[PDB]
Amino acid sequence: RECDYCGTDIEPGTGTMFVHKDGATTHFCSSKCENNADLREARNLEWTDTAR
């Protein structure tokens, strides 16, 4: 994928994946993805695998 989108990344040959309601999702990564993303609009996201 791309930490869902968070093109950064973090935590070994395992990692981990957060998640939201509605069969929707959020595979995941670092404390730079999280919080931010968990609170607005992905599009606008830069740094990473979006505003790449």
């Binding site: 990692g15 981990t16 998640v19 309601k21 069969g23 959020t26």
Partner: protein, 122 residues
């Protein structure tokens, strides 16, 4: 995780909305309701009297907790939310339908019923 009066929504339709957590079901001591687990709480509020109704003595189980569940697969999983499903003494749901995904779990501790109803089980 999830006891006294921590609240959690529905994903099925039983006719609920959210529910307060009385006891963690199992036996004495015990202090925790983790998906798969089964809770002894009630309605904090439920639709316009579908079939349940606000403030209704209840029985529900575990399927969504942002407490993060460590998968024997040294893996990790969690959710943006915390809620579960009602039940008929017979570990049997009511909501005819599901909502947000869930986790293998259930299966492991009995419930298929939802296991599949679920839009997606993670």
């Amino acid at each position: 995780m999830i006891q006294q009066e921590s609240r959690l929504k529905v994903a099925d339709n039983s006719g609920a909305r959210e529910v307060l957590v009385i006891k963690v079901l199992g036996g004495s001591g015990r202090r925790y309701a983790n998906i798969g687990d089964v809770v002894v709480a009630t309605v904090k509020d439920a639709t316009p009297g579908g079939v349940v109704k606000k403030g209704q003595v209840v029985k529900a189980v575990v399927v969504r907790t942002k407490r993060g569940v460590r998968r024997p697969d040294g893996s990790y999983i969690r959710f943006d939310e915390n809620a579960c499903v009602i039940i008929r003494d017979d570990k049997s749901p009511r909501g005819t339908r599901i909502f947000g995904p869930v986790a293998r779990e259930l299966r492991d501790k009995d419930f298929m019923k939802i296991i599949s109803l679920a839009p997606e089980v993670i």
